[PDB]
Structure formats: structure tokens, C-alpha cells
mmCIF file of C-alpha atoms and ligand atoms in Angstrom:
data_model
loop_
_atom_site.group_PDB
_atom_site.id
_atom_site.type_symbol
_atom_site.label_atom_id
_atom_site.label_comp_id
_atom_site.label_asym_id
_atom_site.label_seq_id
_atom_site.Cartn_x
_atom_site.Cartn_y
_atom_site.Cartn_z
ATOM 1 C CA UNK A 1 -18.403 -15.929 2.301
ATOM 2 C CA UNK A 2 -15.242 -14.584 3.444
ATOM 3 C CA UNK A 3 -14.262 -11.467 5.286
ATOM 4 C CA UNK A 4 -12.494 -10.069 2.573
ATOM 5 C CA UNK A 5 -15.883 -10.372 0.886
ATOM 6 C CA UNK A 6 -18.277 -9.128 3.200
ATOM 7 C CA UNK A 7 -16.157 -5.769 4.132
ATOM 8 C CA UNK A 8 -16.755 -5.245 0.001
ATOM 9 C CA UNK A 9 -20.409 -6.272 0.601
ATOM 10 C CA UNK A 10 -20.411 -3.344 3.551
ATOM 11 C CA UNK A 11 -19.235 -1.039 1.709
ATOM 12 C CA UNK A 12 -21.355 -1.334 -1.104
ATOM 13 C CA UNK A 13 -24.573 -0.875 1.792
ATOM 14 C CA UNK A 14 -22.739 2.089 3.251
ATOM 15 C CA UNK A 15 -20.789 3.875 1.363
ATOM 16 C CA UNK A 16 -21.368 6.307 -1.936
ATOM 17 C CA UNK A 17 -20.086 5.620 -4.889
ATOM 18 C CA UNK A 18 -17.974 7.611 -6.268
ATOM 19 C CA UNK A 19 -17.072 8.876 -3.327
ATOM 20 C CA UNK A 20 -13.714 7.812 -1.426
ATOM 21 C CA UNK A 21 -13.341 9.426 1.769
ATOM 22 C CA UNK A 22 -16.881 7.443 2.041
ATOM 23 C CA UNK A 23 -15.408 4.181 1.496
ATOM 24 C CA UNK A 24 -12.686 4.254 4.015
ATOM 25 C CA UNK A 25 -14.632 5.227 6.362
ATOM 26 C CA UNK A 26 -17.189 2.071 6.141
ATOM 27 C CA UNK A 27 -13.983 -0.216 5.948
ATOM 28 C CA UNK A 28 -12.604 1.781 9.356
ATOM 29 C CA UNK A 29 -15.759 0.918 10.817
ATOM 30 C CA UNK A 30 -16.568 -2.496 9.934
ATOM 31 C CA UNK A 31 -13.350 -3.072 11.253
ATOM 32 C CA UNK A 32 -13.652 -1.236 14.291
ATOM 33 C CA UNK A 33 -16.835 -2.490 14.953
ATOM 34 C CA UNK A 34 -17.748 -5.718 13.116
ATOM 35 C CA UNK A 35 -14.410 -7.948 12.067
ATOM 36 C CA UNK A 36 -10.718 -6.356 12.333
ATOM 37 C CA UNK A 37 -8.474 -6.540 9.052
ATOM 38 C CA UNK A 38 -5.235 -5.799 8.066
ATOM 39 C CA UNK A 39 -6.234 -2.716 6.079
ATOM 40 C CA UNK A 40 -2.913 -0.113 6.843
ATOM 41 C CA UNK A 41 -6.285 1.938 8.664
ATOM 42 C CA UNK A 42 -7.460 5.674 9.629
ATOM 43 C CA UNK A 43 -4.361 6.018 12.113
ATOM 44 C CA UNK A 44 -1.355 5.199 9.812
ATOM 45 C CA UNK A 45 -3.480 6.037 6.930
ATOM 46 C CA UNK A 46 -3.268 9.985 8.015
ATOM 47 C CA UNK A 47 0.471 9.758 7.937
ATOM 48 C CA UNK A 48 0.397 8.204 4.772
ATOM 49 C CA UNK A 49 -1.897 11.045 3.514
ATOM 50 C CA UNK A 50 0.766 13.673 5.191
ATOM 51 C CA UNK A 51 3.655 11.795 2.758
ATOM 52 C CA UNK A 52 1.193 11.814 -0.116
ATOM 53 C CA UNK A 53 0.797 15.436 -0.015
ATOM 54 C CA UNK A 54 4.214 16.673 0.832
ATOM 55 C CA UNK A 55 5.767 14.395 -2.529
ATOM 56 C CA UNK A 56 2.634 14.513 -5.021
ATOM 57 C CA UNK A 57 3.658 11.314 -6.393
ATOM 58 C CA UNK A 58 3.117 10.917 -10.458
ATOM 59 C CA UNK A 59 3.490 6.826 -9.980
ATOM 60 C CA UNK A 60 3.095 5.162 -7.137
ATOM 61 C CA UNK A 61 4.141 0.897 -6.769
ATOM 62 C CA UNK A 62 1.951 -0.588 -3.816
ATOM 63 C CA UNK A 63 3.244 -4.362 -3.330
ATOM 64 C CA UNK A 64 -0.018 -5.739 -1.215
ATOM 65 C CA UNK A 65 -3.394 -4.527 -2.059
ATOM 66 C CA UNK A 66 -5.775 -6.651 0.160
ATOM 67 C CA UNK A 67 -9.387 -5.391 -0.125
ATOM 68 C CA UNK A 68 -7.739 -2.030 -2.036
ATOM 69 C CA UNK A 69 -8.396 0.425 1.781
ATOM 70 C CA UNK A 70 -4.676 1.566 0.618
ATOM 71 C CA UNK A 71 -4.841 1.947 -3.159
ATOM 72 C CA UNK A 72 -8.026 4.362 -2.230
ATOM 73 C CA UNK A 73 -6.720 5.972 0.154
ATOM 74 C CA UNK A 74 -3.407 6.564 -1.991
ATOM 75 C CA UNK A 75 -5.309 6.976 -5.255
ATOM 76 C CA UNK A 76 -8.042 9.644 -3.850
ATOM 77 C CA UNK A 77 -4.955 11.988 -3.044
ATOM 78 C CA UNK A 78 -3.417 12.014 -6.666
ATOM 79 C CA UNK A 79 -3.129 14.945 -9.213
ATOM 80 C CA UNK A 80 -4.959 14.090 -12.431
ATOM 81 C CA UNK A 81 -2.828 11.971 -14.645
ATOM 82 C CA UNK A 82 -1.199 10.429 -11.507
ATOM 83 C CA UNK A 83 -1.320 7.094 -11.128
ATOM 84 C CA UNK A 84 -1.156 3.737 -9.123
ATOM 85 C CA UNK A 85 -0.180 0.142 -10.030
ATOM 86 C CA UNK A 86 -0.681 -2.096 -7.305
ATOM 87 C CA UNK A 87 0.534 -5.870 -6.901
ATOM 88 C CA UNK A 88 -1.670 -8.582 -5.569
ATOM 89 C CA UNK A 89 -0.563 -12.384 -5.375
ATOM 90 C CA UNK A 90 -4.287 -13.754 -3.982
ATOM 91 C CA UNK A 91 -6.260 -13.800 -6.805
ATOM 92 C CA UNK A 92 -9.994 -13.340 -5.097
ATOM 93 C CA UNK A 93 -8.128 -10.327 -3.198
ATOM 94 C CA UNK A 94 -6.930 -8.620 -6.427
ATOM 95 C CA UNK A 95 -10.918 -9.263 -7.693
ATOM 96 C CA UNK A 96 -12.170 -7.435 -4.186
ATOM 97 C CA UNK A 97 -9.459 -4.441 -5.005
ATOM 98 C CA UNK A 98 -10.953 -4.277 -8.284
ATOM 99 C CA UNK A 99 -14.359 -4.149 -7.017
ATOM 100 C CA UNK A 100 -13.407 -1.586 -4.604
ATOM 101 C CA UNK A 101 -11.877 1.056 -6.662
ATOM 102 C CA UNK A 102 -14.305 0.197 -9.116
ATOM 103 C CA UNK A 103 -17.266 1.382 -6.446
ATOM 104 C CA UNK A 104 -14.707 4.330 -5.130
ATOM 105 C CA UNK A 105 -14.831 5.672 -8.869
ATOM 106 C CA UNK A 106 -10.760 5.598 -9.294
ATOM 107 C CA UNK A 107 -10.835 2.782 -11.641
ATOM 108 C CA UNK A 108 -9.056 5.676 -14.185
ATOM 109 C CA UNK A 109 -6.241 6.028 -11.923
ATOM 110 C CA UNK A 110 -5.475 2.843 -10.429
ATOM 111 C CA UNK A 111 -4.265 -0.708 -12.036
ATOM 112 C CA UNK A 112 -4.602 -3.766 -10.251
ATOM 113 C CA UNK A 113 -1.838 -6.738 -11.217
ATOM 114 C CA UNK A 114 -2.739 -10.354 -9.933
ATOM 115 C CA UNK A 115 0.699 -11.739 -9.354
ATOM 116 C CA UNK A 116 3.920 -11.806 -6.938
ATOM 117 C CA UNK A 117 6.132 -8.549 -6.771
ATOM 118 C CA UNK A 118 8.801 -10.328 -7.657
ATOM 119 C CA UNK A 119 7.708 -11.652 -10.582
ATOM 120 C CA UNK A 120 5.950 -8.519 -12.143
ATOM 121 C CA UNK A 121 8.504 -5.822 -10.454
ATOM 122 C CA UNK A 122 11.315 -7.426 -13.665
ATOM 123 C CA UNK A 123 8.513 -6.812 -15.746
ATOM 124 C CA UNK A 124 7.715 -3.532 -15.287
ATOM 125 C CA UNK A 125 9.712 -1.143 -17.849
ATOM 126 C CA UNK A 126 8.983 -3.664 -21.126
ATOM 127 C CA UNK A 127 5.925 -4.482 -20.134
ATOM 128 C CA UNK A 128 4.066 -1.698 -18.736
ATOM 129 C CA UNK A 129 6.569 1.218 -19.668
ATOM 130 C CA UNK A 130 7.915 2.320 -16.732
ATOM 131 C CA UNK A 131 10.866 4.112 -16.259
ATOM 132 C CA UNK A 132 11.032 4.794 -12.700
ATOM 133 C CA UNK A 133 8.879 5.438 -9.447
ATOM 134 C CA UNK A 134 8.090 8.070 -7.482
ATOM 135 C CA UNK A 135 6.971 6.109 -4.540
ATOM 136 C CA UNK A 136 6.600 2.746 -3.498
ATOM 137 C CA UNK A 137 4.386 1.669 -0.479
ATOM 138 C CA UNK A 138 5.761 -1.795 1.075
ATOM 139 C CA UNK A 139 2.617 -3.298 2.832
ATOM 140 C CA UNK A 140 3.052 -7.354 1.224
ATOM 141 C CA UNK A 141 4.777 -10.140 3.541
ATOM 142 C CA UNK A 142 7.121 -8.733 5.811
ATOM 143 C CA UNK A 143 9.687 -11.225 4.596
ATOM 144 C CA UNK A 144 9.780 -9.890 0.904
ATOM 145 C CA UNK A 145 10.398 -6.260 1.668
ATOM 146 C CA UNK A 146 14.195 -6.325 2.011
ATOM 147 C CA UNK A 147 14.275 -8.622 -1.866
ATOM 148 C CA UNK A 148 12.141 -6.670 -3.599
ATOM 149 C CA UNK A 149 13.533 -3.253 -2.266
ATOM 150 C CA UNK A 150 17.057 -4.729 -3.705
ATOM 151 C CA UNK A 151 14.837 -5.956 -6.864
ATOM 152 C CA UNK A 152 13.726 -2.463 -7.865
ATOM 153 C CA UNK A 153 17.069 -1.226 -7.509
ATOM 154 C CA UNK A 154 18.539 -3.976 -9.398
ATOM 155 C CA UNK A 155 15.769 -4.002 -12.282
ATOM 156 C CA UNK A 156 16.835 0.675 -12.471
ATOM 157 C CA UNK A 157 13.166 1.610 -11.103
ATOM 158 C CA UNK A 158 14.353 3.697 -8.427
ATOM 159 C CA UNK A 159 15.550 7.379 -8.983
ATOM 160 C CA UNK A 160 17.622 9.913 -6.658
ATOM 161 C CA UNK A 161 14.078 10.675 -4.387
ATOM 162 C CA UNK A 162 12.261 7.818 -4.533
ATOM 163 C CA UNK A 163 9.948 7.609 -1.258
ATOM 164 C CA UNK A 164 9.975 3.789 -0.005
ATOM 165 C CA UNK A 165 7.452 4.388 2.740
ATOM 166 C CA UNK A 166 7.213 0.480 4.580
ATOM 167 C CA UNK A 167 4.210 -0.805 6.806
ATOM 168 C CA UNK A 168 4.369 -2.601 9.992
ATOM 169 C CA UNK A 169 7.997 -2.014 10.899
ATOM 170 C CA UNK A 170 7.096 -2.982 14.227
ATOM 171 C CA UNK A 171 4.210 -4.975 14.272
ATOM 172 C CA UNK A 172 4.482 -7.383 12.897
ATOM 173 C CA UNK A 173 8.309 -5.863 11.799
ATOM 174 C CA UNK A 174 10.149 -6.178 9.236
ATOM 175 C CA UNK A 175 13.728 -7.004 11.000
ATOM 176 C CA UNK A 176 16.081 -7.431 8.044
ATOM 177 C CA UNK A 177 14.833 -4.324 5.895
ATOM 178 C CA UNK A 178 15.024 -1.656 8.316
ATOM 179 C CA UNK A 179 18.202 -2.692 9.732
ATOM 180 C CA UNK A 180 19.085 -2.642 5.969
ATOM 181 C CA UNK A 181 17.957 0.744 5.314
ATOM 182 C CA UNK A 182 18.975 2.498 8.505
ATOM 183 C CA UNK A 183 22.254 1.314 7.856
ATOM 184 C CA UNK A 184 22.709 2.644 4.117
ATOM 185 C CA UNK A 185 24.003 5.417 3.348
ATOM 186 C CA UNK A 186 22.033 5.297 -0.190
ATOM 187 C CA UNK A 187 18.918 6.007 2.224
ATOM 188 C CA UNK A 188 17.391 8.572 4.254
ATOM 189 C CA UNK A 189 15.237 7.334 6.799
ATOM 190 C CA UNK A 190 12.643 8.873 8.858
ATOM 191 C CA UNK A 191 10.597 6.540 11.363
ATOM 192 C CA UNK A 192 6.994 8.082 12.316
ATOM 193 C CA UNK A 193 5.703 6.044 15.555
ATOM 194 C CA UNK A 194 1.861 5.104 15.322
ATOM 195 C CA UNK A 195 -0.581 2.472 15.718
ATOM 196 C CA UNK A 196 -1.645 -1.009 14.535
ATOM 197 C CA UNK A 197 -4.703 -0.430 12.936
ATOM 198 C CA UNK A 198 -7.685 -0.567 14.604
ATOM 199 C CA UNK A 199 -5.937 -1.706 17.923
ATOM 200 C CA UNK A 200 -4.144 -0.270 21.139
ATOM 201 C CA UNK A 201 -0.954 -1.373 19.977
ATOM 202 C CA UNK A 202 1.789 0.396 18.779
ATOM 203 C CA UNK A 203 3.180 0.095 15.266
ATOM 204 C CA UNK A 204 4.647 2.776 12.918
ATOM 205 C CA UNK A 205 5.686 3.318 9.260
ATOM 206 C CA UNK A 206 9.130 4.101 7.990
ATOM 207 C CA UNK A 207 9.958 6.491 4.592
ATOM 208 C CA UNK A 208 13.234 5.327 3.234
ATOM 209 C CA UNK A 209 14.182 7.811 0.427
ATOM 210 C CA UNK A 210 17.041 6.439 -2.077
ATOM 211 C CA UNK A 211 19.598 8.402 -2.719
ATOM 212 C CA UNK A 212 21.946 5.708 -4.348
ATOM 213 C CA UNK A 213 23.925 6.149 -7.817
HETATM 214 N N1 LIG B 301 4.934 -11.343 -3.003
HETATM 215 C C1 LIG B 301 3.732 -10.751 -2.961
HETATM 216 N N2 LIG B 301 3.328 -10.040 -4.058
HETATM 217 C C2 LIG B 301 2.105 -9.444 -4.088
HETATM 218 N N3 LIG B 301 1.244 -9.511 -3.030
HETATM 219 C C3 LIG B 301 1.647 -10.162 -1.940
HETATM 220 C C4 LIG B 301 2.882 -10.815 -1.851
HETATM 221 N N4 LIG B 301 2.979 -11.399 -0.624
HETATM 222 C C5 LIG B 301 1.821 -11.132 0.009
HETATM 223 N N5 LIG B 301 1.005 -10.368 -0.771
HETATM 224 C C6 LIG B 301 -0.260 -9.760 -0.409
HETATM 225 O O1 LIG B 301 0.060 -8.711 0.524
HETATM 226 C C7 LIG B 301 -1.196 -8.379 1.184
HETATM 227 C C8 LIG B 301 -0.847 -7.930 2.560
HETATM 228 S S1 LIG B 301 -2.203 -6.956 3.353
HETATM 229 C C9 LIG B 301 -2.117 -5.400 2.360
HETATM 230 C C10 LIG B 301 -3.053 -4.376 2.999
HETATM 231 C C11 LIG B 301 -3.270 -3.180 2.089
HETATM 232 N N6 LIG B 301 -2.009 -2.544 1.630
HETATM 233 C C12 LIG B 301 -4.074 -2.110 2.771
HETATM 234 O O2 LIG B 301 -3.524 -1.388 3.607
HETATM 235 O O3 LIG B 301 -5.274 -1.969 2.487
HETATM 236 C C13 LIG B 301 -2.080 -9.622 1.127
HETATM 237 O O4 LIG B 301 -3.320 -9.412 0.431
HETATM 238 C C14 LIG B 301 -1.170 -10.648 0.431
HETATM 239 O O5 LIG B 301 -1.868 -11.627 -0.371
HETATM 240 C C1 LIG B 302 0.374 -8.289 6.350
HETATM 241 N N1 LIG B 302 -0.049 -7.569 7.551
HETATM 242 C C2 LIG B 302 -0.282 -8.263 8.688
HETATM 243 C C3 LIG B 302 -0.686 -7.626 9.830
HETATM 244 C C4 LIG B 302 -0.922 -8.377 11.102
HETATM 245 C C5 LIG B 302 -1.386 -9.679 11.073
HETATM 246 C C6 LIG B 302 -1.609 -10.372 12.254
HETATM 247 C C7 LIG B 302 -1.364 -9.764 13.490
HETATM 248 C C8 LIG B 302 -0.908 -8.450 13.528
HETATM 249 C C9 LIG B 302 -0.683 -7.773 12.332
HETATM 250 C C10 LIG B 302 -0.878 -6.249 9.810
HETATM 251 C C11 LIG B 302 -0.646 -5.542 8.637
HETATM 252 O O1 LIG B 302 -0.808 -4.201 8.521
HETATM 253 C C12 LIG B 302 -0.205 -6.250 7.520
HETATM 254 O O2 LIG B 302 0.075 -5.565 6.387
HETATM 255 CL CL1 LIG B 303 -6.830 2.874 12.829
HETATM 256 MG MG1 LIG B 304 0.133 -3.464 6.760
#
């Protein structure tokens, strides 16, 4: 099997379903303790729980859903009638995410796409009747979070408010987006310093808001 599989396996054997807080925690620990993974973690995860609260989100985009540690840590924090749509280009990860939210019990809330951002991001208002987002985590390849950032604008998902809140801008970075950001006046940027997850090594998240016409 993979990795990707046996963290599901794990948390099926240790976990409750139904039961989200539950979940994380056996992915935090096989990670810790068994196999690291590039789940955004407990560390960066709180902050991201902090940002959750402050905006209560309605719809949230995730580009990057892995083994789906994010969408349940996002999803377990919405109002009822919130919801997620997350975007997954590997297919057996988008099956694992499915799994996962599936044993977290937030099936209801959360929709899992198999394909690239920035082929389903044009899709998005005809298709699946959005009009625009509340928040959008950027957690996919570094490399695409400058395009599709410019996508969503282009494609009128983003509204004056919209919370762009970007993994990894330090490790492994994300050079060309945050210079990009930083220096735009159509966004407000706040940088909060952490950790990689699971690791000694600093990393850190940064919330872009749009404030753009
Ligand atoms: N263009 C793209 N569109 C959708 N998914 C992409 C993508 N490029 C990479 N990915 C996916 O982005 C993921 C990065 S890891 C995501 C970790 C997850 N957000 C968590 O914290 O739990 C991988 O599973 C990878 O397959
Ligand atoms: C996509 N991705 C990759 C890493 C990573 C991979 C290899 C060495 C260090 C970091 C961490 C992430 O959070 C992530 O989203
Ligand atoms: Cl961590
Ligand atoms: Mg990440």
C-alpha cells in the first residue's frame, strides 16, 4: 500500500467516527510518530482554526486536498449550511479525501472534485453555481498559486473580503505569489510565522484579503 493509504487505514483503527477533532488527531500522530506527511498539521492548523473563526466562512475553495487533514479540519469549524469544495488532481488522493470525510461524518458539508484547479476553478459559476468565495485556502503546488489566484479573479469569484489564506510561504515558499500579493494594493496581507508540520522547522501561512474592484 501507500502512505496515503495506510494514514486512512490508521485512522479508521483509531479514531471515532463521526467524530473530527478525533481524526486529526490520529493523522497528527501517525505522522509524528509513524511516517511524516504533508498534511498543513496541529501547528498551522490552530492558526487556520483562529482565521476560520474570526471570518465564519459560508464557502470555502481548498486547491490541494491530500488525505482531506485540511478539508476536516476546515469543514468541522463551519456553521450549518456552510460549505467546502475542495480540488484534487491525484485521483487515489481525492478517493482517500473522500474516505476521510466520509469516516469524519462531514460528507454533508464537504465536496470533493478530482481534477486540476485550473481546469475546474473556469468551471465553477455554470457548473456548480457559484457566485463568489468567501475563502480560499492555497495548499496545491507552490508553482500554481500565483495563476490560479489571477484565475479566480479573472473568472469574478473573488469579492471585496475574500480571505486567500496560502500554505508554505516559506517552506517550501511560494516566491512569485507573495511578492505578488505584498506588493498589491488590491490586497491586505498579514504573515503569521509558524512551523512546518510535524518538524522543527520554521514555516508560516499568509491571509491575503482582496480588496480589488
Ligand atoms: N493543480 C492542482 N489542482 C488540484 N490539486 C493539485 C494541483 N497541484 C497539486 N495538487 C495536489 O495538491 C496537494 C498538495 S498537499 C495538500 C495537503 C492538504 N491541504 C492538507 O493540509 O491536508 C497534493 O495532493 C497534490 O496532488
Ligand atoms: C505540497 N507541500 C509540500 C510540502 C513539503 C514537501 C517536501 C519537503 C518539505 C515540505 C509541505 C506542504 O505543506 C505542502 O503542502
Ligand atoms: Cl504540527
Ligand atoms: Mg501545505
Amino acid at each position: 500500500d501507500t502512505k496515503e493509504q495506510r494514514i486512512l487505514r490508521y485512522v479508521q483503527q483509531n479514531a471515532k467516527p463521526g467524530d473530527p477533532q478525533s481524526v486529526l488527531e490520529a493523522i497528527d500522530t501517525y505522522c509524528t510518530q509513524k511516517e511524516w506527511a504533508m498534511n498543513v498539521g496541529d501547528a498551522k492548523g490552530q492558526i487556520m482554526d483562529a482565521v476560520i473563526r474570526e471570518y465564519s466562512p459560508s464557502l470555502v475553495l481548498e486547491l490541494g486536498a491530500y488525505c482531506g487533514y485540511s478539508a476536516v479540519r476546515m469543514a468541522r469549524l463551519l456553521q450549518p449550511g456552510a460549505r467546502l469544495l475542495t480540488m484534487e488532481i491525484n485521483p487515489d488522493c481525492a478517493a482517500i479525501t473522500q474516505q476521510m470525510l466520509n469516516f469524519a461524518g462531514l460528507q454533508d458539508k464537504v465536496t470533493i472534485l478530482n481534477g486540476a484547479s485550473q481546469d475546474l476553478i473556469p468551471q465553477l459559476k455554470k457548473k456548480y453555481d457559484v457566485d463568489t468565495l468567501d475563502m480560499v485556502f492555497l495548499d496545491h503546488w507552490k508553482d500554481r498559486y500565483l495563476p490560479d489566484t489571477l484565475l479566480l479573479e479573472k473568472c469574478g469569484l473573488l469579492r471585496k473580503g475574500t480571505v486567500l489564506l496560502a500554505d508554505n510561504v516559506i517552506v517550501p515558499g511560494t516566491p512569485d505569489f507573495l511578492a505578488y500579493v505584498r506588493g498589491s494594493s488590491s490586497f491586505e496581507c498579514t504573515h503569521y510565522s509558524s512551523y512546518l508540520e510535524y518538524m522543527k522547522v520554521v514555516d508560516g501561512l499568509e491571509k491575503a484579503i482582496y480588496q480589488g474592484p
